[PDB]
Ligand binder design. Structure first.
Ligand SMILES: [Fe+2]
Ligand SMILES: [Fe+2]
Ligand SMILES: [Fe+2]
Ligand SMILES: [Fe+2]
Lengths: 382, 382, 382, 382
């Protein structure tokens, strides 16, 4: 009946947006910055650019590149050792989801009483984190705009979530010039992740008109730009729109939550460490069809948003076109269409399905299923 | 080429969203609140609710209801004394635009070398304000979401603006249950203010895909709800949508700015002190038609968004329908169609145009004009 | 949010439906009947038919005919006097609106302590009335299916209403064979009265899907049958469908209430005592246009229900066609178009409008108006 | 040529409509209720709700929960024993069809001398029953609004029906808040039972425009909500709309009767004791195709009612779309499509056809068949 809508205070997007990193640290009060990034991204001009604007604005910088794909709690432990030994004032995360998830963890662990795993759950944080300037490199996760901090436990080998308004970065930066170097396959997976965020947020039980505003636009932008962005990575106009789309999808799903697509994709990531992007892609249209009966009117909307002609059609028929439209986009941009080829096996369906209902994202799915109905979705996508 | 996007960190909307004010002050550290409001709102059951939930969460309160319809520099001063003498920690603003502006001004003055004018202009603020929670009771202004602080200088009899990311409230609240008591004519005017925010933001030189997400949905929401809401204030559903519409329109124009409608409306409100909502409403269609040639494609979008059938028409014809649609909506809800009836006089046109050209809102208008062209628009609205 | 839906327990309709009056009096335990009717109807064949079947089933009868157009309170006294002296067990009403109100009044006065006017208002009745078998003769009022009883207070001159589930007749009878003799003007007026019941109930604040089932079908029936009915009274099919329409519109309005049409129609009957049917008729399209902004979507349904082609149209344009259709039907059947022609004076509007805003039927109107706005509608129908 | 139309005097529906059970028992003169229910419903909150409001209203209550799915005469015996032993005044049934038929049966046995099977047939009852308040729990049977009481003869093992106006419950209550807990499969089967009531009544020999009004809206509502209701039972709007739909389908079929779908369903219920709703659903599209030639116009209507596009089509082609729309809905909600999978045997068809031809509902079917043809329908549904 009532909703909250969280989003970073100050956000920057457009080509050359990276040029504000240094300036926005001066305004936040940051003297020294912990730059949190990947081993991969650290050798060209991505971390190098923010590193240039940081020293230009007179901000000292100790870097932490020890962030694994799937951010670990020991990554926060080792990361916090730098923040404390080098005495950093501000956190600058640069990369995809992983650097962002880790920078927040460091912010939490540096500000909240010893240990890290104990603060898992809802609004359970007491004191403000150190300022975080999250410069985002991927048109997919939108973590730079999210309330969510998800790390992986070393002890239990199971991920945990910390959901707090205090995890909202102080400033977000989305510069498409930093994204040009993404290989086609990667821009496709991150692109479908963004799509998945948009439709799941659009059809979520927690969907509202304010959230819809962002989700609808994201779906539209993705449908007009994802193909062209994977076609030619140097296409700036396409990159820009993909960047805005992903940021919009984030503003949406941060406040409306997701559904079964992520609930199932996290399991594929759990058992096979399949890339989160592709896991969402191959499942999307199968879960979307399953969700269809829950709100065919909004699926009719999705079709229209994706460019489909909808004129003389019953709502159910227009809804159908949304499914087709999603699989057409999926097939055009290279996405593998069957789990059979991603290494997945049929015996792991019951376990994954069981886990999927227990996943945090399942609660907001428009259709309340069971373990058998989820196993049938997997088999349809196999 | 580059864009910023500012929005309050944490936002609440939906029926009964007032119930979080006390809890939200607790999380921001506020021990004693300054309640900034109107004499007319100060009794019934609207500021008593925010006074109730603040009392149940254990926050002490000093009320300042000395806010004028056009927030004055002396209103900030007098309210600051109450902030200082009663020793308040946090600012709760309840009402429409006036309490929110005056609230921000109080926040500024309590934090920056005492003076009004001294800090007018762009990013001129150095220090964080006291936390501000803003409860909005009007589906019109969106000042609870805005970076602007507009006061009037009694020394010069002319208004001034302060623009800062620090003016952004800590929390915004949009409870449609509070708005229900709004009389028909008032909701007609406030609706059109929002409508004006949405289209000016959408066609603005500073518009972008992200900005546009909010503007578009707001036009769709207003086109579908404003009529219903002026017909029957107790219609909760229409009240809900108007609140989101006004809020989204705020997320749009806060970051894409406005244009000639507001530039011209402030002049009507500067002389005949015409209600801001009605000044926008009466001028909207005429400034729309003027701006048409700057972006026909986006005016075609507006027609579509307002529910018009565009199927076989040329862009220009479709643009025409957006103007028609706006004036139909304007007439339906009871807006006076001619400035002549609002006591406006033709001899004042030249001077009004001159001022409009200088107004801060003039720069972002998609069509660059002169005094003669602006004067002629007035003539078309007489 | 919660709704009641009242209707007689047993209802008969169709050609020769009258053939059950006797049998149904037997089943209710009535040994002797009070026949409550008009002087006009009481000789020819109409109360004679009902008389024949009462005799055939062994029920002896005493008849009361002193019912005025607009049933007086004294009419009830005179009816109760016959009810007691003749020792009556059951009450059979035959006629239009009046004999039904008078019948119910007698029923009330016979079972509740000696005085009539004192029982005005909502659920004020404690005791069951004698069984009432209501045989309807006009495709207009639907009083045979209604919880209301409305008599004129002879001492004050003003009408009063007793609203109770205990006013529902035991059995209703709607035999179209009994309506064949109605003059064209009478069938036009009663038909418009039925259409009014239907549209006001459809757009009422108290409307719901159960209620709308009856109203939608009644509008559809009237659109396809009223012209045919006024053109030729001996047309059995047209009389059948009008009889069913009127009954359905009763089932609707009894439970969703009415609106500004009826609140204004009663005032025209209050001063010039215009026939209720024609008053509603001349007001309908004008009050409808005023109500449009409250619910354009439902007015768009009305256009469709009435046989208009809505295909390419925006909702508003579709809603327009509902007004057009109504006034087309009005004109076709010979309803007078201007109040001026019915001896209505302009200086009576301020009083009438004031009185109309207080009428019981005004609270359920979808648009909340006032003195001036309702006066404006009068001037439009002038 | 002449029609009766029976329905409870007073009906409540909408969220929280249960809150009137106690108040309504007071007005019917009831001092001590016999709560007639299932062991299942009887703990949680639904007979608890009616118990709460009964006791709050000062009504004492004895409870009989020995009602079987397929209520036996011996249940009525046992229920009646409690009615008399505990000195009960009024009967309150809460549940689906079972508690209602059993509640009616007890009411009959309480006022009608000797046995049960004796009173089987039409208007065979002479005495009024004790007042009956019926609180409905299922959007399916609509027995709370019906003239029928069907029990099972334990001596003969076959079923019997008592059809009477006196079987009409005094008050029906339809609170969708009480229907939320129904598992997906049940709401689907009860929904399709409602659908079957609506289409059979629409196309029955005994159909008329009063009856059709309720039938049409029930079809429209079911086509717009059943998919949503089975997808998420906590969907309040879909629950409301299904509840109003079932009620309307009841008001329709109670008066227009049913046809071959029910005639054949009862035999599946007889032999395999298949759930009524699923037996109906699996048969609907095949019986509908068989009945098509009796009335292609109304199937064309049914197609349009279920949202199908009929614009270009011949009546026959439009009618075809109704059959497809029915089966599409059935599959969408996970209804089993083949009797082969319900444990049905082929050489039971001859016996089932014989019995279907003798069933009470067979008479009003718009197509007169024989044993071969009915058997041939079973074969198509196999
Ligand atoms: Fe994701
Ligand atoms: Fe404004
Ligand atoms: Fe009337
Ligand atoms: Fe049934």
């Amino acid at each position: 009946r009532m909703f909250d809508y969280l989003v970073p205070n100050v956000n920057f997007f457009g080509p050359n947006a990276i040029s504000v990193v240094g300036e926005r640290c001066q305004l936040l009060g940051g003297k020294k910055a912990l730059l949190v990034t990947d081993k991969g991204l650290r050798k060209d001009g991505a971390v190098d650019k923010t590193l240039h604007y940081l020293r230009e604005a007179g901000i000292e910088v100790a870097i932490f590149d020890g962030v694994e794909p799937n951010p670990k709690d020991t990554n926060v432990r080792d990361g916090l050792a730098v923040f404390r030994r080098e005495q950093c004032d501000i956190i600058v995360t640069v990369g995809g989801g992983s650097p962002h998830d880790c920078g927040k963890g460091i912010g939490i662990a540096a500000t909240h009483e010893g240990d890290l795993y104990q603060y898992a759950g809802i609004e359970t944080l007491t004191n403000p984190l150190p300022p975080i300037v999250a410069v985002n490199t991927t048109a997919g996760t939108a973590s730079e705009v999210t309330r969510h901090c998800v790390l992986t436990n070393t002890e239990t080998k199971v991920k945990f979530v910390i959901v707090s308004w205090r995890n909202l970065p102080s400033v977000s930066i989305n510069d498409p010039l930093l994204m040009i170097g993404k290989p086609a396959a990667l821009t496709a997976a991150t692109g479908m992740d963004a799509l998945t965020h948009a439709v799941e947020a659009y059809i979520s039980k927690d969907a509202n008109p304010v959230t819809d505003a962002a989700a609808m636009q994201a779906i539209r932008l993705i449908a007009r730009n994802l193909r062209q962005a994977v076609a030619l990575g140097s296409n700036l106009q396409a990159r820009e729109y993909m960047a805005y789309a992903s940021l919009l999808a984030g503003m949406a799903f941060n406040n409306a939550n997701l559904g079964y697509v992520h609930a199932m994709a996290h399991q594929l990531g759990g058992l096979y460490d399949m890339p989160h992007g592709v896991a969402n892609a191959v499942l999307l249209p199968h879960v979307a069809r399953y969700n269809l009966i829950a709100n065919p009117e909004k699926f009719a909307d999705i079709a229209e948003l994706m460019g489909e002609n909808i004129t003389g059609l019953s709502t159910l028929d227009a809804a159908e076109k949304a499914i087709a439209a999603i699989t057409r986009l999926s097939m055009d941009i290279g996405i593998p269409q069957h789990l059979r080829d991603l290494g997945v096996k049929e015996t792991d369906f019951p376990y994954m399905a069981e886990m999927a209902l227990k996943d945090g994202n399942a609660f907001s799915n428009p259709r309340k299923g069971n373990e058998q109905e989820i196993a049938a979705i997997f088999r349809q996508a196999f």
